Design a protein around this ligand. Sequence first.
Ligand SMILES: *[C@@H]1O[C@H](CO)[C@@H](O)[C@H](O)[C@H]1NC(C)=O
Ligand SMILES: *[C@@H]1O[C@H](CO)[C@@H](O)[C@H](O)[C@H]1NC(C)=O
Ligand SMILES: *[C@@H]1O[C@H](CO)[C@@H](O)[C@H](O)[C@H]1NC(C)=O
Ligand SMILES: *[C@@H]1O[C@H](CO)[C@@H](O)[C@H](O)[C@H]1NC(C)=O
Lengths: 214, 111, 177, 177, 177, 208, 46
Amino acid sequence: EVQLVESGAEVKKPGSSVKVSCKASGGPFRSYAISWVRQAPGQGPEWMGGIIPIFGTTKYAPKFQGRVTITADDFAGTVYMELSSLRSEDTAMYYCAKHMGYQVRETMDVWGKGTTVTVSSASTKGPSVFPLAPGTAALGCLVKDYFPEPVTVSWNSGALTSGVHTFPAVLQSSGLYSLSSVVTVPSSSLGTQTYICNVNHKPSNTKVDKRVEP
Amino acid sequence: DPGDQICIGYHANNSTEQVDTIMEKNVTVTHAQDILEKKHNGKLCDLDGVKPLILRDCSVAGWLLGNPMCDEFINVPEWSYIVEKANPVNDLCYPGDFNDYEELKHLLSRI
Amino acid sequence: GLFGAIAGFIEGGWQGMVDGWYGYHHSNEQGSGYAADKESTQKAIDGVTNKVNSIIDKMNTQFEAVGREFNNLERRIENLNKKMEDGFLDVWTYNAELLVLMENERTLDFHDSNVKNLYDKVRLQLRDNAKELGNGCFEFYHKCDNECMESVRNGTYDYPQYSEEARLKREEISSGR
Amino acid sequence: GLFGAIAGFIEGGWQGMVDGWYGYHHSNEQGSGYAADKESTQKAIDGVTNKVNSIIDKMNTQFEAVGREFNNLERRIENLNKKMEDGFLDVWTYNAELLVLMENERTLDFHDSNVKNLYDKVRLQLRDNAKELGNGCFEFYHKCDNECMESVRNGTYDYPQYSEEARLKREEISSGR
Amino acid sequence: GLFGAIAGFIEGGWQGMVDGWYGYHHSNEQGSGYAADKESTQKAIDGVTNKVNSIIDKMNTQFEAVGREFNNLERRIENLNKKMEDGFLDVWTYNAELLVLMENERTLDFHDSNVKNLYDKVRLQLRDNAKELGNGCFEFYHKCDNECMESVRNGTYDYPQYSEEARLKREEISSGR
Amino acid sequence: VLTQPPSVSAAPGQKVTISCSGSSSNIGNDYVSWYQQLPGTAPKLLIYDNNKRPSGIPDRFSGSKSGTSATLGITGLQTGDEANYYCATWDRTAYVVFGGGTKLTQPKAAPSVTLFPPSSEELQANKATLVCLISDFYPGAVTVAWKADSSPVKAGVETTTPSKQSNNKYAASSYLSLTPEQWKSHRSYSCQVTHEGSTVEKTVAPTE
Amino acid sequence: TKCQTPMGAINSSMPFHNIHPLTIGECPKYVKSNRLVLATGLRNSP
Ligand SMILES: *[C@@H]1O[C@H](CO)[C@@H](O)[C@H](O)[C@H]1NC(C)=O
Ligand SMILES: *[C@@H]1O[C@H](CO)[C@@H](O)[C@H](O)[C@H]1NC(C)=O
Ligand SMILES: *[C@@H]1O[C@H](CO)[C@@H](O)[C@H](O)[C@H]1NC(C)=O
Ligand SMILES: *[C@@H]1O[C@H](CO)[C@@H](O)[C@H](O)[C@H]1NC(C)=O
């Protein structure tokens, strides 16, 4: 019955700090502890630490003791987790999880949905969108050097679905991302019909469409 | 020979937090919770998104009637609250009187 | 305190039991140590937590002053307005202050009760297999190792299992050695 | 509970004692059975009955809204009237709710106290003529038939009359048989 | 009473202990006599004194009616004024009456607690060097003269010092003489 | 530092067992709980206190601590049980430790390669990207080599990992980055894509 | 802010405040008190 809702995705540069929150339904004062557990892509969960109600005491894991601070605002039904001196291996999904009782312990019976923090040295950048020009035949769009994920590519304002294939982005050594979207189309239609690819990168507020001609 | 022992007991700590009781004041307690907010920031702010209408040295009469000195308020944006000084210097430049002025000010509390 | 346990027959508390509000200290051949009682501490946190929530909730509706203006010949209603509004700030301040004072006493007495009851829990498990020493402690008439201690701490102490050893020791003590 | 008796050292209550709130279960050669304690149950009914009457009585005078109408240029006094009248419905609702919550706790704790005190009544009658077993029961060191049982239930138990038989039994038990 | 001591296991009080609220009666070879417990009586006076002061203080701000006059066509505001002012006299009368009733119970129960705790203070000093008789009294297993009595009254009773004499007497009693 | 077998396998209806193991200072004294994780979702409490089971969880799941190690068992197992499973415990300085985890559990497709050259607009902006799009292969393993004219280039390549598609085949992308002078000055550039020992090769050249 | 007073904004989760009774927004409830603190723990040793 208790819902744990966490704050939005965060994107940070190395050596800075993030502070995630977690709002628990009911209360607002609680009789159970809350913990923070993270999970890195392809890895098992790691417990970070938790906070005990009324007592207010905190317990941290060896791995983080020294750069994590867990705090509470009991009137708001909210606990916070701040992790500083960030590194790229802190890129992970961060879960708040409640225990059955007042002690922090191996048993956590309700979890939040998760919130991602990405630690990269890239600043946020909007894409450059180039056309990829033309039995069938292929056309597409190069969506080049943007940070961070995601980006939306639709063809003809979402009209063309048949034969379309957007590819997972590549992670360049520069830290920036690039992807490309391709559509197989009948050669007979080439120099009469019209193809626009609609690139939207929310994080950068860049909306682009690029007409693809031969 | 003495035998093993188990004792029952309770938590103590270094708290100097203190609570009152009908029978005893300043009882020192292990844990306590303040529930009175005593701090403010000394400023007038936007209430959520919306900036308030801060009449400066104008009165409501001055603003609505358009005392020449109240020109800042010729065409005001939507507001969250109105702020009016206790004694606006710029009120009825031509002396007089404003009928049902308080009943109108009351209406504005809803606009 | 109303229940005579905290700062009573148990004189002073334990800086060294850090993981709960009430608990145990034990001492036997394998050593000594403190251990919190999870269940009592939890009932207490539940109680106090609910209390703090109930106070917030009951003070949720409560008088909210609004500004009204009056001219120089509406002085009688301006006064009636001031007094009405001051009247409610006073009723509500009294209500909050008195609720706080009254509930503080109950809270402090609640914990006191909780320690008395826990002491009595142990008392009525052990019975005459232990001797009440009067300071909050029991001295066993039989050997009680860490497994036996835990059985006291978690509600599981088997009296019949030790009573024979217990009767032999009580026997030795009455006889004088 | 504050007194540790109801859902405490007496774990759970008796579906089978129907004629009162507190009472006795006995077991001897002639059988077993339940019996209400009339006097405690009566003090309790007196208490709770008076409580319910005192609540009704104190809530007897209490704010009573009246309708007043106001025209379109009496908006400031119409608002002052609404707020005054809402202000009292709020004070009074808080008073009723809080009185009810506060008195419910006291009532539930009152009964708990009543069972503890009755247990202690029997305890201090019997003394070492019986053994406290820890679950709310006493096991006699002497034979106690229905007449002897009633003497416990009604305040009349003669300790001196059984103590000799009592000391002989305690003697047999310490010796081991 | 909630604590079962005053008009409970101690049935009735002492007209002849005049210098305090709680205390002792003793009886030995050199005679008998009453003696107040200064420390408990003092904590009680402190409690009740503070209580009476807190009540006076919290009732310090409280609604104060003022007279306002109204003409024959201001009947709606004259009624709104009457009702506002009556409304506060009612809130405040309820507050005073209910505070008085609620605090009287606590006070009477406070004293009851105080006698229970004092009884328990003596109980856990003496332990099995005395026999609980059940009426508020202890009968010593050893000789206890006026110096020994004072040690009970002031927190100083040395159990180890009498326990040998105590074990010999308990021994004689179990054996039958 | 808590030991758990990387994977375990079985068919719909049998009873699998996931073990978990560590020293006296975790499992020996302290209790174990087990968790289930389905992709896209937070871990979910399956059992606690060694063998208790919270409401919502069917009694096909259970576990025990047969020594200084503990095991979880599923029976009558469904497709839904395809997931990751972790044991947790408390380790005395003091922390909650998890186990490493355990994953619990279509003909040969040739890839279609599609090599695009630099677009003139990228060229106008003093940059050049060759884009090599590989799709619909199985199994999802391809190596990718680049050639300048007839000879190989390792400089300036970024190839993605392979990636399950909506139709259960795989995809990938490679990007060679070049200066305009480099791209203009060569005969051809070719993307070679190998898959199950079959090389495909696409070539492109500067507006011929 | 979410809560404003003629003397300044309030930024608080608390149930009460003692700043000024005429507020607008989502505020705590005003009292004349200088001090309000609930016990949660127990009486702390000498
Ligand atoms: C209680 O403590 C406060 C703050 O230290 C102090 O001002 C006051 O005089 C004390 N009151 C009593 C009754 O001891
Ligand atoms: C209680 O204590 C004993 C240790 O002597 C232990 O074996 C038993 O499992 C414990 N019971 C529970 C429910 O924790
Ligand atoms: C109490 O119990 C005894 C039964 O043993 C009975 O004879 C006696 O009359 C009873 N006393 C009263 C006052 O009911
Ligand atoms: C307490 O009692 C004894 C009398 O036996 C006396 O000698 C001792 O001094 C007393 N202590 C105090 C602190 O009054």
